[PDB]
Amino acid sequence: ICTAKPRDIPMNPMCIYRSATNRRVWELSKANSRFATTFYQHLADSKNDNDNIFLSPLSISTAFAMTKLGACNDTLQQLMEVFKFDTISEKTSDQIHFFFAKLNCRLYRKANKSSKLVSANRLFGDKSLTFNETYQDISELVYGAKLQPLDFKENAEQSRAAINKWVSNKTEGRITDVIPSEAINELTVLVLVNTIYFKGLWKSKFSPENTRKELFYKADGESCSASMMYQEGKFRYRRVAEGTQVLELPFKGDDITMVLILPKPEKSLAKVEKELTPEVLQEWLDELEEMMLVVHMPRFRIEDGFSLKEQLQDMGLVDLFSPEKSKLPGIVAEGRDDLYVSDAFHKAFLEVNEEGSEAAASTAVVIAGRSLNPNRVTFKANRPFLVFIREVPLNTIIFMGRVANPC
Numbered sequence: 059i060c061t062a063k064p065r066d067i068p069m070n071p072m073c074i075y076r077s078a079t080n081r082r083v084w085e086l087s088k089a090n091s092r093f094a095t096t097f098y099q100h101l102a103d104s105k106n107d108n109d110n111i112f113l114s115p116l117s118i119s120t121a122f123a124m125t126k127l128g129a130c131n132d133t134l135q136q137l138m139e140v141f142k143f144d145t146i147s148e149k150t151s152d153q154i155h156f157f158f159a160k161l162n163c164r165l166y167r168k169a170n171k172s173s174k175l176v177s178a179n180r181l182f183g184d185k186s187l188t189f190n191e192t193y194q195d196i197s198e199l200v201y202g203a204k205l206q207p208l209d210f211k212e213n214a215e216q217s218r219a220a221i222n223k224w225v226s227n228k229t230e231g232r233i234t235d236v237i238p239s240e241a242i243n244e245l246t247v248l249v250l251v252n253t254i255y256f257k258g259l260w261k262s263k264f265s266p267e268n269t270r271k272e273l274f275y276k277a278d279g280e281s282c283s284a285s286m287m288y289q290e291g292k293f294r295y296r297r298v299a300e301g302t303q304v305l306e307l308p309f310k311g312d313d314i315t316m317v318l319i320l321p322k323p324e325k326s327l328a329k330v331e332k333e334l335t336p337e338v339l340q341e342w343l344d345e346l347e348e349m350m351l352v353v354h355m356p357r358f359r360i361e362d363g364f365s366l367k368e369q370l371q372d373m374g375l376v377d378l379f380s381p382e383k384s385k386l387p388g389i390v391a392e393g394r395d396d397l398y399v400s401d402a403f404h405k406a407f408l409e410v411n412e413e414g415s416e417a418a419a420s421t422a423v424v425i426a427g428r429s430l431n432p433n434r435v436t437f438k439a440n441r442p443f444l445v446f447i448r449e450v451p452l453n454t455i456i457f458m459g460r461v462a463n464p465c
């Protein structure tokens with residue numbers, strides 16, 4: 059529950075780590091964003107400069123915190139480090155989860171229903187096994203993560219298909235193939251899943267009479283018909299250092315806003331992407347002022363889908379993915395120490411139009427399946443701009459991306 063005190067909810071898991079109440083929530087937002095930034099940069103490195111990039115970093119943190127609940131030692135420590143939970147001012151590693159839940163409460167349970175922002179988590183564990191009873195309870199109590207019994211052992215590729223359809227249902231059709239083909243096997247014990255959906259209407263619309271098809275040129279040497287939108291109004295805006303523009307497009311309500319970032323034409327995104335931090339982002343935010351301006355942005359849809367393994371390994375999640383060293387003895391009943399994350403996937407969808415925006419994303423951590431290779435199917439394109447959908451009052455980057463192809 060959201061309306062509760064720190065001691066009230068007995069959320070003491072197995073392990074623990076070292077290292078008014080509203081300020082906890084806020085410290086976790088700083089943590090989350092630091093992860094978000096860093097995760098973004100590593101992920102950027104993996105991709106081309108001209109490739110699209112979209113994701114919910116909030117989603118990832120959530121799914122990995124869910125996982126954290128049955129972690130121990132060199133798995134629990136790394137989890138806190140990598141996801142900057144070891145930054146929040148509190149001495150115990152089980153205190154993260156009370157605040158994450160409260161953050162989640164603020165995010166997904168508001169009276170202000172200008173824009174729709176929902177989330178659904180769920181554990182899908184093998185049917186034959188028994189899961190630690192405290193584990194289970196906290197999972198559902200803190201995150202809302204019910205445990206659904208699927209037949210990993212026998213009917214494997216249909217349970218892969220049932221988790222995907224579950225995500226699909228919770229993301230209004232947008233997120234369809236979270237779990238890639240052939241990743242859930244006969245040994246798959248548990249699959250931890252997050253889901254976030256957003257849909258907002260602009261605070262000020264783009265009339266559809268003013269949209270114009272104009273052609274877009276890629277770095278390879280190709281053309282596509284972009285659909286530019288147009289509008290004129292007062293918008294929080296700033297031309298910052300190096301001739302970079304930061305424009306903010308608030309949604310009906312003012313609580314959630316889309317924040318664009320475009321570099322001076324000559325320059326690339328790289329410089330800005332390489333120096334991108336939470337501090338940097340808030341600087342610009344504080345700088346912005348109300349301005350009469352003409353906005354031209356595309357009518358477009360981007361979808362991004364990837365594994366988090368290599369990237370997260372790079373930032374320090376090494377034990378968790380390791381078959382020999384991974385430490386997760388709070389999940390099942392006996393302490394099965396053959397629990398290790400095979401692979402973890404993410405998939406996001408962005409759609410911006412005249413009427414507003416729709417964003418969806420999902421994260422699925424898979425315990426003991428296979429670890430497949432990055433399945434890449436995307437093309438490079440020119441002149442990219444960063445997008446960020448954020449919740450103002452609670453300092454959280456919900457979605458975050460780099461649009462690079464508006465067709």
Ligand SMILES: *[C@@H]1O[C@H](CO)[C@@H](O[C@@H]2O[C@H](CO)[C@@H](O[C@@H]3O[C@H](CO)[C@@H](O)[C@H](O[C@@H]4O[C@H](CO)[C@@H](O)[C@H](O)[C@@H]4O)[C@@H]3O)[C@H](O)[C@H]2NC(C)=O)[C@H](O)[C@H]1NC(C)=O
Pocket residue numbers: 226227228229230231
């Ligand atoms: C994801 O799965 C959800 C269930 O867990 C499911 O949501 C439920 O869907 C039904 C839709 O049939 C919702 O019920 C609606 O309730 C109102 C009651 O006021 C009805 O008016 C409405 O029926 C429509 O109304 C007409 C009758 O005047 C009829 O002619 C129309 O054709 C139509 O049937 C529904 O009965 C229910 O509230 C939903 N929520 C829950 C929690 O159950 C989702 O559809 C599914 N989403 C996706 C994307 O798959």
Ligand SMILES: *[C@@H]1O[C@H](CO)[C@@H](O[C@@H]2O[C@H](CO)[C@@H](O)[C@H](O)[C@H]2NC(C)=O)[C@H](O)[C@H]1NC(C)=O
Pocket residue numbers: 070071072073190191192193388390391392393
């Ligand atoms: C489920 O996990 C809990 C902790 O995550 C385990 O219980 C703890 O066990 C130690 C002693 O063995 C006690 O000091 C703690 O107070 C226990 N917690 C509770 C709530 O009992 C528990 O052993 C696990 N259960 C199973 C079946 O494995």
Ligand SMILES: *[C@@H]1O[C@H](CO)[C@@H](O)[C@H](O)[C@H]1NC(C)=O
Pocket residue numbers: 073074130131
């Ligand atoms: C891991 O942590 C538990 C308690 O936190 C401790 O008992 C154990 O010795 C640690 N090390 C290993 C290798 O398990």
